[PDB]
Design a protein around this ligand. Structure first.
Ligand SMILES: NC(=O)c1ccc[n+]([C@@H]2O[C@H](COP(=O)([O-])OP(=O)(O)OC[C@H]3O[C@@H](n4cnc5c(N)ncnc54)[C@H](OP(=O)(O)O)[C@@H]3O)[C@@H](O)[C@H]2O)c1
Ligand SMILES: NC(=O)c1ccc[n+]([C@@H]2O[C@H](COP(=O)([O-])OP(=O)(O)OC[C@H]3O[C@@H](n4cnc5c(N)ncnc54)[C@H](OP(=O)(O)O)[C@@H]3O)[C@@H](O)[C@H]2O)c1
Lengths: 534, 534
């Protein structure tokens, strides 16, 4: 009835939740195309729907498709629209896109996340880069491929997870890409809204499923705590108690049909007024959408003394910004190293650097590319041998328009250089700090965004979301590990791009120096420049 | 089908949106009790449903009930459960409570809001206090009266408005009580969740209805701008374009059925996993849930010079806090007046006050009760005659557990003393400042919350929400009126209760002095103390 005559594409349609979304969509009259990597599991599920639930064979199509590969996505969407080998009847359009597919990523503490295929250890099957492609790359690929074939009034439904906004020890390779997906979905709602295509996000809590109990078992083991501790923490956070199988009003997990019923509402015309909207299937867990504060003053640097602190600035190609940060830190007497991903930027910075009395030497310049982990680890070791430690780090983006009408290689470079690259850098720093203990004084990390791009900062928003959840879990893992066998890491993220004034760089540099050279520590993760500094 | 055999109570069920909620609920198999103040309109609508839509008479019950009167609410709920004169068949329970009733309040700029019945001018029919009772009092009353008769799995659906979070010139008597309702709903979700009763809030945008066009017509007139300007601003804010009656993909208002369809989803078991959740029926208007920042430093007072600034502290009964604020402002050389609602507090403060070199006289003490507007206006005039002006004001709460199991008079005193009282005070200050121009220098107002109540601060959250939206619209009205015929008002709200440390009062006083005595102005409305000051 409610999805009568609509064409739905459900990725991961044979998974634990996907099976229930598929079933409910069929009961409501949709024609469903289910995708997955395991072609047999798709065929078996399709057969069960036909043979045991009296579903007409024309209404279910099984289509193998690795959604992390844009070539496969385009080929599969073409088949759906025009017919093909695996699609017997051309379906002409997609009315509902359920971006439900999502791997679990490698389950490891940040220090242990595998970056290269040879590092992947049995329980896991994915590098960091593969997890990114199977979590946010996949949703991005399907939406770009499908959007030309979705008429006005169509519905894009992205499945994220509430845990993209909570502590989630040992799952940074999962929750940081899912946080990126949240910001991608909000940018897509803005872009597709002009076409009448709505884009909404479901955030399931822990859902009764083999998946959640497998993951919670692994996370209890990663933390060295008893079975059931991860679940107990989230059960306590729920506000809504609910009838369980024995009729008792208790804390319990929501079920897959709860998620499926939300997807039906969003797929149907009953949700026609919603876009860019969150749906938290969590029994009322109180989880903020963002941890943020706004600077309301400029700090005085006269009191800031970083004598004897080694501070590594990790830059991509941002010569002038990196040099300005180094100048400010050096005026506070810090021992500064600047690392550059881009060798041309490194050369340009050497020239620039050659251009009250102070006994502070000029910054050392090194090559530091986190996408070459073995060279990065060696560079950090050489710095430790020469300077004795690395106390703090400043992390800039990896490189200095539309989210849909964009070349495939621009999307791939963004995912690789900014998401994988930034998380890989944090992995390399965390590992180095664990391997080279330097006492109990916290290591401080400041992520700093790019400046305003004059075009809405759509891609910077995605990096911001990923970095916030990287920071949240890194803070928790490092605190926990420092008590239960090592210094903890405190981290924040400075957001420059909401301010477009000439004083922006100077204001940012002053706060970086204040936050690294003084005792002040800020609880909020994201630290925004004000819109007007003066 | 989806509400088969459920008992729904819909307040305002014969209004513009209520009629459509009622109709959809009946189509989905519910038995519906509709309430309103106009008994005839209810009877006429019930007759139309029976005579023109083939609805069985047993399934619709018309019940006149002014939901702002708790006595009437209890009597009507008793009738619904046990049967009575207007309820022929006892219904035994309430499965769905739709708190949809809501007046429009007096439509006036803050300076013109009617406080007393004789001030109400034709277009309007309500004082400020009546509007509060018809907007948040009503929802509070019904939920408390109905909750004992709602079994586990039941659903409370509160209709607020997105405009409780946006600019809305000339509607403070409407949007500030609706903002209070938002925080009341979140506290109720927490309290009722242990019983398995979920509580969710719908935030409609502008909904195609006689109501919205009547209100937008009045708001265009209040601002002296052309017909259609208010609507044009909100149409621009929508992200989702949508098919209109002629098949064009354009900006348009959502319809009443959009709101009704959301209420059906929330009434049905398909939403069983949702509580404390917002549903924004707005075509994706980007509207934050809160304007806030967190203090990340303590300010230096040595540079703060308020010489020649008259600052009025408006206190209820908070002797020690008011005196501490006065001491701090006087050490910054301000000319201080303290007003007290409570005459006993005024006497206690006189005794306390009698208890580097400075030439700053002790604070003047006056009676200032905003619920006696004629005496308040005279007091402000006498201060102006004696001291020459009132530059800035600090506003404390009117008085120094559960939201359900609470005596009726505690609820009534909170609504009257804190909500009506605080808005009435701002009305009195705004009017005084308009009547006694003192140049173009902005008047600054700092609302300051109570300290931590050690019990979750449920009532303080409600006042916080109302004050934030009071501030938002007051800032906009006063800015607009200062350009289009007068000084603008800047206001903020300091939140003390998230911090429970001994340094709390001193830290708060320092920021009050800094924000009133220096040039710094903060864009965010709510200014939170950090959880840890040191
Ligand atoms: N408690 C929960 O289960 C829970 C809570 C919050 C969020 N979620 C989200 O819910 C969604 C569904 O997961 P689930 O609970 O059903 O777990 P699941 O059983 O592991 O399902 C994951 C699905 O994703 C598919 N998939 C992964 N990578 C893919 C790729 N590159 N191309 C195509 N398909 C791919 C898998 O297909 P193959 O098996 O063929 O690879 C599988 O069907 C995920 O996005 C997950 O993050 C789950
Ligand atoms: N564009 C929109 O219409 C819009 C947008 C956002 C939010 N909303 C919200 O939607 C809800 C429904 O309003 P509407 O659009 O249907 O406008 P409406 O036609 O004015 O409906 C308001 C209803 O509230 C009832 N009511 C008011 N005070 C009452 C009291 N003390 N006791 C009992 N009933 C009372 C009225 O009943 P009587 O007529 O008998 O007094 C009437 O049925 C309101 O809460 C409103 O704030 C509306």
């Amino acid at each position: 009835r409610r999805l009568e005559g609509k064409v739905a594409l459900i990725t991961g349609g044979a998974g634990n939740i996907g099976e229930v979304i598929t079933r409910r969509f069929l009961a409501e009259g949709a024609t469903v195309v289910i995708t997955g990597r395991n072609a047999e599991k798709l065929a078996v599920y399709r057969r069960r729907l036909i043979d045991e639930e009296r579903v007409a064979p024309e209404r279910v199509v099984a289509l193998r498709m690795d959604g992390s590969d844009i070539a496969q996505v385009r080929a599969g969407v073409a088949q759906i629209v025009h017919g093909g080998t695996d699609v017997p009847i051309p379906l002409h359009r997609i009315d509902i896109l359920v971006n439900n597919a999502g791997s679990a990523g490698p389950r490891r503490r940040l220090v242990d996340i595998p970056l290269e295929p040879s590092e992947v250890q049995p329980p896991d099957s994915e590098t960091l880069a593969q997890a990114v492609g199977n979590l946010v790359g996949i949703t991005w690929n399907l939406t770009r491929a499908a959007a030309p074939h979705m008429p006005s009034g169509s519905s894009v439904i992205n499945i994220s997870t509430i845990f993209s906004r909570t502590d989630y020890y040992g799952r940074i390779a999962y929750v940081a890409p899912k946080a990126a997906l949240n910001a991608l979905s909000d940018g897509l709602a803005r872009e597709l809204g002009v076409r009448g295509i709505r884009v909404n996000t479901i955030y399931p809590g822990p859902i009764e499923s083999e998946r959640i109990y497998t993951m919670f078992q692994a996370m209890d083991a990663l933390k060295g705590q008893p079975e059931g501790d991860t679940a107990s923490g989230f059960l306590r956070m729920m506000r809504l108690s609910r009838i369980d199988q024995n009729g008792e009003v208790v804390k319990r997990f929501p079920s897959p049909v709860d998620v499926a019923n939300t997807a039906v509402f969003l797929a149907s015309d009953e949700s026609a007024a919603f876009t860019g909207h969150a749906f938290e299937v969590t029994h009322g867990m109180e989880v903020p959408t963002e941890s943020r504060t706004t600077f309301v003053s400029r700090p005085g640097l006269r009191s800031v003394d970083a004598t004897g602190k080694v501070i590594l600035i990790c830059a991509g190609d941002q010569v002038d910004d990196a040099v300005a940060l180094a100048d400010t830190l050096r005026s506070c007497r810090a021992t500064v190293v600047i690392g550059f991903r881009d060798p041309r930027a490194l050369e340009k910075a050497s020239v620039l650097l050659r251009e009250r009395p102070t006994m502070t030497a000029e910054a050392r310049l090194v090559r530091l590319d986190p996408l070459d982990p073995r060279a990065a680890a060696q560079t950090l070791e050489q710095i430790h041998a020469e300077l004795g430690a690395i106390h703090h780090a400043v992390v800039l983006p990896g490189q200095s328009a539309s989210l849909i009408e964009v070349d495939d290689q621009v999307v791939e470079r963004f995912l690789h250089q900014e998401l994988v690259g930034t998380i890989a850098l944090a992995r390399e720093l965390a590992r180095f700090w664990e391997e080279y203990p330097s006492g109990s004084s916290m290591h401080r990390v400041l992520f700093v965004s790019n400046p305003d791009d004059q075009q809405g900062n759509q891609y910077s928003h995605i990096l911001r979301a990923a970095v916030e959840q990287l920071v949240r879990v890194w803070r928790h893992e490092s605190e926990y590990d420092s008590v239960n066998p090592s210094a903890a890491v405190w981290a924040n993220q400075l957001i420059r791009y909401v301010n477009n004034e000439m004083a922006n760089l100077d204001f940012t540099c002053a706060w970086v120096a204040k936050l690294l050279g003084s005792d002040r520590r800020i609880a909020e993760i994201n630290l925004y420049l004000p819109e007007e500094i003066v």
